[PDB]
Structure 1
Amino acid sequence: HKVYVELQELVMDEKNQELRWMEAARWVQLEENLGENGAWGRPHLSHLTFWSLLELRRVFTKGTVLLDLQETSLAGVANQLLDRFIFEDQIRPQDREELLRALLLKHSHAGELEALGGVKPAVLTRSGDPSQPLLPQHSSLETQLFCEHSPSGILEKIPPDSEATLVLVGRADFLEQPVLGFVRLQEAAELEAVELPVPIRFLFVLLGPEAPHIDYTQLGRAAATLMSERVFRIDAYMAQSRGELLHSLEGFLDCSLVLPPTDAPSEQALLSLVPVQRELLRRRYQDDPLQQTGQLFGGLVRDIRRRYPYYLSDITDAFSPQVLAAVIFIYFAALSPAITFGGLLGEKTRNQMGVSELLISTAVQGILFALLGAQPLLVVGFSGPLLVFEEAFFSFCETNGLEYIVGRVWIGFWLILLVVLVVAFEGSFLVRFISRYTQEIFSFLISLIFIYETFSKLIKIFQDHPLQKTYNYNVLMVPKPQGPLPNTALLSLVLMAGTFFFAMMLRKFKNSSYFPGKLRRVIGDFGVPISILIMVLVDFFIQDTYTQKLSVPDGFKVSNSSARGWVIHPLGLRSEFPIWMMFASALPALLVFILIFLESQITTLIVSKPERKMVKGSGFHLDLLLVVGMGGVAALFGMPWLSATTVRSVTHANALTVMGKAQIQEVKEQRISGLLVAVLVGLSILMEPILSRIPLAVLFGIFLYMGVTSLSGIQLFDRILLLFKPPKYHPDVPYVKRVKTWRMHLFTGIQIICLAVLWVVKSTPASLALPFVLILTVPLRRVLLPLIFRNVELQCLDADDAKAT
């Protein structure tokens, strides 16, 4: 049982001359004292003096014990203890009345102190009238050094199941020698006289006359420090006589160490004691998500059985407001690039595919993926390399003289067959070979390209509206701003920078210590929507300046209703389809499959790494099947296929993270967020008045915030930051100590060279040959580096787990 110790002593108040027991310390966790004003001091360890322990041993060697006493009140305990004192000739038969009357006085506490006008220690007297002691009345040292919402707090520190201990110290003049009385009850009782939070089990009584080298407050502190150690209170629970208590006291005195008066500095002399005290105390107490299975379709069933038992938890975990904030954030984060790519694809293919098709496809592939998905934190959507492939395929069909929207149907069919074949043979276990190398390179490149595109958009805005001395004002701005405008470029820059600054400031305030934790975290989790609202209001207040806004199609209509319909006839739309193209459409399908598979699986690897404390399981085969099948079915209806997005998924996962004081505690995983985001993206056509007032330049700040925030966990980025610091300030990670510095720098340089080569290939019109080089990084890590480095260096640098290396 845990213990709660309380020390009380006989005192007299100056208001009225009446004795009473008042408390003066406590030993819940660390000792605390009671000042003169009536407020408790500061907690601290319990340091004793030499004479205190000496006299404690001396008076305990011949003390009086009452073990397994059967009483339930303080009066019975007091009477039995006085009877036991009388039995062993510790006090005289005529000293019993005064002692019993003194032990049964009222026990005050810290609260009543102010109502008394102060208290001072007192001594019992035969006539019953107190007097002032004939001994130096200097205040204690602990009072001098530690004294000159609390009840609930002390209730919280006291353990749930714990028993109380009461120590009574007092001075009486009619005695002849110090007397000790130790009592243990048969069962914990709540004594009415003396009040404590928990019920009393043990009881100390310390009385005696004035003697040299005896300070009774220090004797009480020594007894309470005895009663606060684990081993002594265990031995006090089991003991049945006094000899066992004496043996425990000898063991207690064996494992104490003295610190003499040393002239050394305080902190050094007090910190030199840690190993010695440690030694003395030691002397005192003497499955896989990816795996090859011997069954057809094994991975699919394995992932189903792993994930679907968590469906009710996935539904329920969505009741926090942080989920709503994450929804509002990712809605814009996924809508803006959707609109941009929609406009580009509409202007690229003569409006064969536009914004509405992309929006509908995004909505459907979000709803279905959120309902039937294994990891509902992914965000599916169109990408850039996919746009490049669409460009190339449209150019190819324009050159050879075939249709375009029809061939995509056969490409989707080939995709369906290939994904069925791949899922049948569980060929996703190859994800095991993708190490941290490729994940880090991919994420770094993606974030860097994101930031680059944002800055490119800004520079385009500056190029469209230059800084001139005069402008024309009979300009028609109905379709699009023709010619430069006075204040657009700078208002756009101001709004973007302001949004970025507010987002960063709120992100830092979230982790600060300025408000109550609940409201602070609630406000910090809604940082991005608050900043967006602020900047939207700021733009709404400005009247005369023009700024580009968000615009969506008018209704659920096809982009070009001249040549297209809601359903596409596979045999031929206007002219019949050749046979050789039907059979050769497999060639672009394989490349699209490689792209989709690699991107989706690498995204699932980055999001779902073992380091990010993901309790519920994540599925690979199921996500691939869903994504590719829905992409094919949407290509059937003429809508585009989509894929999992890196920045959007990483931002989604990072938004739903509750962090500890920083420590990553938990990630809120649920299916409601994705469903709501998809429903809003679908219904976006019914929210014209609200979206038509959101300027396009505000979302650039959000894009910069996402690109900067997604860059934190990357380790190549950390090693790049370490490229500048001198080796004196390098961190305490294993890859610093195990390998020399100028080898780590060579590693980082090799990886940066790989980045640069990937970038150069990305700028080359042979961009579609981007995936191959990427997978060619896998042999590089498997073969070439072990020809340069050593095995321990390579295991320590490219570690799959952070904690274990």
Structure 2
Amino acid sequence: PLQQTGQLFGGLVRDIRRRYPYYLSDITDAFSPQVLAAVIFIYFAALSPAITFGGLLGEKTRNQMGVSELLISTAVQGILFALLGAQPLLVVGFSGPLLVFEEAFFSFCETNGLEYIVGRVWIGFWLILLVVLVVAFEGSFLVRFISRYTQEIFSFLISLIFIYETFSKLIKIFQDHPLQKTYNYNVLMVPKPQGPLPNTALLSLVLMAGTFFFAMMLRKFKNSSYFPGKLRRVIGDFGVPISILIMVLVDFFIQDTYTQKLSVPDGFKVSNSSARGWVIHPLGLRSEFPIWMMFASALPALLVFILIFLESQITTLIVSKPERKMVKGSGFHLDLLLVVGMGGVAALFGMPWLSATTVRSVTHANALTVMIQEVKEQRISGLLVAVLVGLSILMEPILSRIPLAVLFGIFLYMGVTSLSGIQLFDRILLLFKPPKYHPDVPYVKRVKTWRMHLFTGIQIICLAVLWVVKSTPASLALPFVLILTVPLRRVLLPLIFRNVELQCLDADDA
């Protein structure tokens, strides 16, 4: 599949030919209650990150893009990906890297006095052109260069960003509402409290901690040895939704204290009507968009493409791993083109660009599998999940009751659980464990301990450089510095290390 045919659009046409004949089979292959249960699993698996990321983005962007835009974008793009995608199992949704880039671009626009929502439109135009070119000359083969080194650095950095953002937002909540001897009660809160309030900071902290604790405990219960087993797994799958429900109820029955809630408009309306409308005028909303930025918003498009490409193609090669028995065709070229073109069109509409995310796609595959006898592949479950996510915006009364601290707890849970599968995290943990306790894994046995620690130290240096670039005003360059790790692994590490050490420390498929 990832072979340079040498013909224009060769990969895309090959994938579309591969997957077209199966269409009716996918439509009529669901025909069962297994799909009706996978729909319920993935609806929540997609809604929880959707609302968390929408809340964070609405807070940072001042609701230029928020929960409503994210929900509608996820729904519509999921419908399109279900009808047209080469791999319907892949679930398109806002991810951590996309949020990081969006924060960076919003900060850049604020510093440069530009309209963020219009710079995004121009970035979308450039992304469409870029993907047309990249798919013309097969560039999906570049995913081969993306080694475990860069994937691990990327995932670890995103998890660290999630954790730090959660705790920084909690610190901000405390700063806004400090623990005081006395409060000027009767403060006005039309948009938000104009002064410190009692019990707000501590209650938000308690809500966050409780949501995190309940999610973690249900995760542990999923893998426990309690209850009839099938029910144990059913409850474990519904862990994050149950924790959200529990903490939302706990907050709901405490009526006197104030905690900030999700900002959701009543119906299908933008989060901030005054700031923007449904359609974004490319030339400008309130003021002229600078000409130089129209041409200069191609490096940001390249960085966004780098992020989406890395995430989506890693997901595609994870799902297409032959161990999972992914019968039928999975197309890198078509998936990437569809995802990023839909993202650019959304950017025109003011809605976020999405990327095929690893966790939710893998969970969908696991839900739709049978025993490993086979995997039930359909485009009906994804379509129903997408339409349910779209209708979720209609449920404003429920959503407006959700505290933001609960979503911060879910954010922290997401980061901590994403930390699990990374071998960089395992080696960082081994930095503390004595050598006598080092597991029996290829890189522990076939590499001297101090050389393993040197490898992990170089990875940590790369992480520190990436974080410094995140904090500096040149935040947008972070994807480029991340891609710089590929040359580091393919050029410098061979000088620093021998081939067997790099084989063990960077093995793909383990």
Global fold match (TM > 0.5): yes
1:394 shift after superposition: 7.0
More strand by share: 1
The match for 1:697 is 405
Moved more, 766-775 or 590-599: 590-599
1:642 shift after superposition: 3.2
Residues 381-421 of structure 1: CA distance to partner in whole angstroms, max 9, x if unpaired? 45676567667767887898987655654543333222112
The match for 1:370 is 82
Q: Is the 8 A contact 1:329 1:529 kept in 2?
A: no
Instruction: Give 3-state SS (helix, strand or coil) of 2:117's partner.
Output: coil
1:782 shift after superposition: 1.3
Q: Is the 8 A contact 1:735 1:797 kept in 2?
A: yes
Q: Is the 8 A contact 1:357 1:639 kept in 2?
A: yes
Tell which structure's C-alpha radius of gyration is larger: 1
Q: Is the 8 A contact 1:363 1:681 kept in 2?
A: yes
- C-alpha spacing 1:674/1:306, structure 2 compared with 1 (3 Å): same
Instruction: Give 3-state SS (helix, strand or coil) of 2:435's partner.
Output: coil
Q: Is the 8 A contact 1:376 1:670 kept in 2?
A: yes
**CA separation in 1, counterparts of 2:93 and 2:461?**
30
1:575 shift after superposition: 7.9
Residues 704-730 of structure 1: CA distance to partner in whole angstroms, max 9, x if unpaired? 322222222211222222222222232
- C-alpha spacing 1:725/1:430, structure 2 compared with 1 (3 Å): same
1:369 shift after superposition: 1.9
1:536 shift after superposition: 2.8
1:423 shift after superposition: 0.8
**CA separation in 2, counterparts of 1:485 and 1:574?**
36
Q: Is the 8 A contact 2:86 2:330 kept in 1?
A: yes
1:431 shift after superposition: 0.7
Residues 243-264 of structure 1: CA distance to partner in whole angstroms, max 9, x if unpaired? xxxxxxxxxxxxxxxxxxxxxx
Q: Is the 8 A contact 1:322 1:526 kept in 2?
A: no
1:373 shift after superposition: 2.1
Instruction: Give 3-state SS (helix, strand or coil) of 1:565's partner.
Output: coil
The match for 2:132 is 420
The match for 2:67 is 355
1:424 shift after superposition: 1.6
1:634 shift after superposition: 2.3
**CA separation in 2, counterparts of 1:490 and 1:582?**
46
After TM superposition, the score normalised by the length of structure 1 is 0.55
**CA separation in 2, counterparts of 1:642 and 1:739?**
40
- C-alpha spacing 1:304/1:696, structure 2 compared with 1 (3 Å): same
**CA separation in 1, counterparts of 2:469 and 2:191?**
37
Q: Is the 8 A contact 1:325 1:529 kept in 2?
A: no
Q: Is the 8 A contact 1:415 1:628 kept in 2?
A: yes
- C-alpha spacing 1:689/1:300, structure 2 compared with 1 (3 Å): same
1:440 shift after superposition: 1.3
Q: Is the 8 A contact 1:388 1:768 kept in 2?
A: no
Q: Is the 8 A contact 2:263 2:271 kept in 1?
A: no
- C-alpha spacing 1:507/1:762, structure 2 compared with 1 (3 Å): same
**CA separation in 1, counterparts of 2:227 and 2:465?**
48
**CA separation in 2, counterparts of 1:294 and 1:414?**
25
1:438 shift after superposition: 0.9
Q: Is the 8 A contact 2:44 2:241 kept in 1?
A: no
Residues 100-135 of structure 1: CA distance to partner in whole angstroms, max 9, x if unpaired? xxxxxxxxxxxxxxxxxxxxxxxxxxxxxxxxxxxx
- C-alpha spacing 1:679/1:727, structure 2 compared with 1 (3 Å): same
Moved more, 606-615 or 790-799: 606-615
Residues 170-205 of structure 1: CA distance to partner in whole angstroms, max 9, x if unpaired? xxxxxxxxxxxxxxxxxxxxxxxxxxxxxxxxxxxx
1:307 shift after superposition: 4.3
Q: Is the 8 A contact 1:322 1:522 kept in 2?
A: no
The root-mean-square deviation of aligned C-alpha atoms, in Å, is: 3.9
More helix by share: 2
**CA separation in 2, counterparts of 1:584 and 1:412?**
13
- C-alpha spacing 1:478/1:326, structure 2 compared with 1 (3 Å): farther
After TM superposition, the score normalised by the length of structure 2 is 0.84
**CA separation in 2, counterparts of 1:292 and 1:319?**
38
Moved more, 510-519 or 637-646: 637-646
**CA separation in 2, counterparts of 1:579 and 1:340?**
35
- C-alpha spacing 1:512/1:458, structure 2 compared with 1 (3 Å): same
- C-alpha spacing 1:585/1:492, structure 2 compared with 1 (3 Å): closer
1:656 shift after superposition: 7.0
1:463 shift after superposition: 2.1
Residues 295-327 of structure 1: CA distance to partner in whole angstroms, max 9, x if unpaired? 322211332344456656756786888877776
**CA separation in 2, counterparts of 1:620 and 1:571?**
34
- C-alpha spacing 1:587/1:713, structure 2 compared with 1 (3 Å): closer
1:626 shift after superposition: 0.7
**Alignment coverage as a number of residue pairs:** 510
- C-alpha spacing 1:354/1:602, structure 2 compared with 1 (3 Å): same
Q: Is the 8 A contact 1:446 1:646 kept in 2?
A: no
1:631 shift after superposition: 1.9
2:421 paired residue among 704, 713, 724: 713
Residues 195-245 of structure 1: CA distance to partner in whole angstroms, max 9, x if unpaired? xxxxxxxxxxxxxxxxxxxxxxxxxxxxxxxxxxxxxxxxxxxxxxxxxxx
**Identity across the alignment (%):** 100
Instruction: Give 3-state SS (helix, strand or coil) of 2:370's partner.
Output: strand
Moved more, 366-375 or 555-564: 555-564
**CA separation in 2, counterparts of 1:665 and 1:320?**
16
- C-alpha spacing 1:748/1:688, structure 2 compared with 1 (3 Å): same
Structure 1 gaps of 5+ residues are: 1-288
Q: Is the 8 A contact 1:346 1:352 kept in 2?
A: yes
Q: Is the 8 A contact 1:499 1:702 kept in 2?
A: yes
- C-alpha spacing 1:769/1:636, structure 2 compared with 1 (3 Å): closer
1:687 shift after superposition: 0.9
Structure 2 gaps of 5+ residues are: none
Q: Is the 8 A contact 1:634 1:641 kept in 2?
A: yes
- C-alpha spacing 1:665/1:549, structure 2 compared with 1 (3 Å): farther
